[model samples]
Target: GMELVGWLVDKGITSEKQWIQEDQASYISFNAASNSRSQIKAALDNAGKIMSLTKTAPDYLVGQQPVEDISSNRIYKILELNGYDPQYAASVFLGWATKKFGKRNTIWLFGPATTGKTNIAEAIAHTVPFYGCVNWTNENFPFNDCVDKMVIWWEEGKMTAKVVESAKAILGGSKVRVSAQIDPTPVIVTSNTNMCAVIDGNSTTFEHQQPLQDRMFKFELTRRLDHDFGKVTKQEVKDFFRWAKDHVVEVEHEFYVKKGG
Candidate 1:
C-alpha cells in the first residue's frame, strides 16, 4: 500500500502545487507513479535537495542582547565552584558565544577525569537547539549524525592519526562529506589527557599541527568541585550570552593577544 501522500505531507509538501514549486522533477516522477512510495523516495534522494535542509541555533541564542551581570549566572557559579580561573571561564564563554555567531572553533577541554569537562560541554549543549555526540574511537560508522546538529561533542578519546585528520576539517569549518551530505558545525572535545600531545605525535610535521592548533581554544581544568552543584537554568544561560556579547572584545584580547600561541 502507498503512503506517499502522507510521507509528502510530512516533508512539507502539502499538494501537487507545492511539490512542483519545490522540486519539479520529483513532482513529475510522483505524477507518473502516484501510488509508488519507493519511486517518490528514490527521486527525492537522487535530487539531493531534501537533505540539504539544515538545523540552526535557536533565535534566542543567536539574537542580540544587552550586557548583563554574569556573576549570578548558574554556569559562572559552577565554573567558579569547579575552581576555574576567571580567565578560563571567560574563554569558555567566548568559545560558546562565537560558535553561536557561526564562528567554528574547537573548544578543547582537557584534564584529569571527573574534572567537569563533560559536565561543562553538556551544559552548553543543553542550551543549544540540537547537539550530537560522536565516539572518536569508532571508525566503522560515518559521522552522518553530525549533519543537522548545531553543536558536535566529540567524547573523550585518544586522537589517532585518522581522527586527527578528520578533526582538521571539522574544527576548521571545512565541509565534511558524509555520503551524499556535506556540512560543518562547531565542535567541542573533552579529553582526559592532553590532546595536543596526541596531535603532535600524530603529525608528520609541525605545519600540519599548526592549523589544528589555530582552530582550537584549549582550557585545562585543574581542580574539581568540592560539592555537587545544580544545573544551569535557561534564564542563566540566556543572561550569560548577553554578558558574553558585551565582553567579546575583552575576551578576544585575553584569548588572542595575552594568551598568544
Candidate 2:
C-alpha cells in the first residue's frame, strides 16, 4: 500500500487538494489504509495510464544547484556574440527568471530578420520544464493548446486588435479558458515588427499601446549574428537556471515595481 502511494506521488499525483486545484486532470485522489489494498492497486494502475497519456518532460530546474561562476556560460556568450549588450542580455534573462515566482510581463523580442530573435527565444524556452509554441490566431479563443505550458512562444504573429487584447490578458496574468480549465500562462513573442504597430503596418497611438506595453518587456535585436550559435545545450540551460536563481532577487528589485504595497 505504501509502495503504491509512493508510486502515485512520484508520478506527480499529490493530495486531493492539489488534484482539484490543477483541475483534476493529472492526479489521483487517494486515501491509504482506509481503502482496500486492491483498490489502491487499481488506482495506481489507472494513474499510470493517465500519466503516460499526459506526461511532459520533468522540469530540469527543479532541485538543480546553481553553478558558482557564469563567466563562461554559453547562453550568455551567444547573446553577447550576437551583439546584445550585457545589460540587454541580463534584462532578457530577468524576464525569463521572473516567471518562476508567478505572473510576469511578456518578453517580446523584435527586430529585423536573422538577428537571432528566434534563437534567443528558443534558447530561453529550452531552459523551462514545459513550453509550447502557440498559434497567434488562437489567442482570442477560449480553448488553447498552450495553456498548460510554463512558457509559450509564437513566431512573427501579427498584432491585430483581438490578439493585442488577448495578449494583454495573458501578460497581465488574467485567467483565460484552456480546454475546460481556466489558467494564465507566460508568453514570448519574436517578431520582425514592433507589436505596438497598427494592424495596417503603421505605428499605433500611445493610448493604444500603453496597456500592452505596460505588460510587455521588449528587447530589440538589430545586429545579425555573423554565424549561427547553434542550439543551447542541456548543460548550458542548467547553468543558466543556476545563474537565474542567483540573480532573481536583484533583478526583481530593480525591474519590477511591487503592486498593492
Candidate 3:
C-alpha cells in the first residue's frame, strides 16, 4: 500500500536543516524523498526551503559582436527576414534592422506621412538578435518546423488585394486555391488602418476583400522619436553581417502538390 508523506516538494522528510527539520519522523516515507513532484494534492505546512542549500541559473546573451551596428549579427538577420534582399544594400542592415523583436514578434508602424513609422520598423529590424520571414502558400508553411517560429508585419497601405485575401485564406486554415506558381504560407498581419476597411481612405488600385482582415492585428504607429544615426560605426556593420552569414542555416523548403496535369 502506498502511504503519504509530509507535503511539499524536495522538502525531504528525514533531515534536520535550517530550511526543513525532521521533527516528525513519521512523515519520513520513501515516497517523500522522490525528486520532483506528482500531480497530487498537498498542504502548505509541508513546505520546505531547498534554496537554503543550493542555486543555479542560465547565463548568456544573444549576438557575440564586439560592437553593435548594421554589421551586427542581429541586423543581417532582420534584413533577410524582411522582404529586403541582402545583395542590393549591404549598408541598410547596419542602422535599420536592430530594433526588431523576436522571430514571431511582428510589428507595424504607421503615422501621418513622414512621421517616421517606417523608421521605427527599421530600427526594430536593427535590434533583433536574429530573425527571418518567408512567403507561404497553403502548401509549405504548415507541419513545417517553423509554423510558429516567425511573425508577420503587414503594411496595410502597401499590401496588394491578393496578398490580403490569400493571407486571410491561409489564416482560416482552409485549403486555398492558388496559381500553380503561387505559394501561400501561414502568416500574421500587422496593419496601420482598420484592417477591415484599410482601403476606405485610399485609392482602389488593389482589390483587398473581406476574410483577410479577420486574421490580422491592426495597430497604429503614430508616435515619433529622433534617432542618432551617428551612434553606429562602419566596422560594426561588417561584423554584424558576418555574424548573420554564419548564424543563418539555410534549409531547402519543398512542398508536394498534384504534379501531373
Candidate 4:
C-alpha cells in the first residue's frame, strides 16, 4: 500500500533503480480486499440477491415455483412441501451455505437409503473443487486432526461404535479444533437417516443434531425418485448450473457467487 511503500522509501528498503542509485520506485502495490468477515451476516446479504434472481427465473427453466419436482408422484408430494425446485434452492443456498465452511468447511446431507443422497454428494464434490476430499485412508480415525479437512462426504458402515457420543458433538455446532497439520477446510456428510435417528439406531458416531441441521439450510428434493430425468447428460445439468452461474456473473458483472446463494 501507499503507506508501506512510503515507509519503505523513508527507510530506503527497496531496490535501487538504474537512473539513480538508491532511488525507490514510485510504484505502489497492495492486495485489494473487502474487510468483510466470512460470517453469516455477509452470507445473508449476498443470499438476498440470489433469492431475487431465483424467484424471478421461470419455473420451467429453473424448475417450478413452490418448487415442485417433475420426477415422481410420491416425491412430488415431498417437493410440494419444500419447493418444486429444491435443487434450485440448493444452488441458491450455495453462495451463502458454502460461506460457513470458508470454502474448505464441513457440510452434511440427510436422506434415507435409496433416496439418491450419494448422488447429490458426488455432484457436490465433482463440480465444486473448492471442497477437499475426505481422508478415507482411515474412516476409523476420529482424531481432531480431521478438522483440517474441507468438504468431507461420509456414510455409516465404518468402525463406528459410540454412535450417540460423536453424533451429539457434531450436531451441537461445536467449534472444531485442529493442530498445525489439519486442513482447516469444509466437511460434508451424507446419510440415509437424520442425525437423531442415526444415533437412536446406534448409527451416529458424531453426535450431530438439529441445531447443526439448521445451520445447513437444507431443502429436500422430494419427488426426485419418480423419474430420473433419464436422458439428461451430466453436461446438461452442468450447463444449467453453469448458465445460472454465468447469468449471475452477468448480472453482477463479476465472479463471486455461483448458481446457488
For each candidate, C-alpha RMSD in Å?
A: 9.9, 9.1, 19.9, 15.9
User: What clash count does candidate 1 reach?
Assistant: 0
Q: Give a tens-digit lDDT track for model 4, residues 45-81.
A: 3433332222211211222123222333222233343
- Tell me model 1's lDDT, rounded to 2 decimals: 0.56
Model 2 TM-score (2 dp): 0.62
TM per prediction: 0.61, 0.62, 0.28, 0.42
- Which portions of model 2 miss their true places by more than 4 Å? 1-65, 81-95, 100-104, 137-143, 178-182, 198-207, 252-261
Candidate 2 local lDDT, residue 44 = 56
Candidate 1's residue-wise lDDT over 1-261, tens digit each?
135544553343434455677678866765773555666555444322332244343333432556356777665665565455544455455655455323336777767766767776776665554566765556544355566666777775554565556667776666766464335667877888655444345454444456666766666665764445555554556566566555544344122223321
Steric clash count of candidate 3:
24
Pick by TM-score: 2 or 3, better one: 2
Tell me model 4's lDDT, rounded to 2 decimals.
0.36
Q: Which stretches of candidate 4 lie over 4 Å from their true place?
A: 1-82, 86-88, 100-108, 130-140, 143-150, 157-184, 196-208, 224-261
lDDT of 3: 0.31
Each candidate's lDDT (Cα)? 0.56, 0.55, 0.31, 0.36
Cα error, candidate 2, residue 120 (Å): 2.4
Count clashing residue pairs in model 2: 0
How many backbone clashes does every candidate have? Answer: 0, 0, 24, 38
2 or 4: which has the higher TM-score? 2
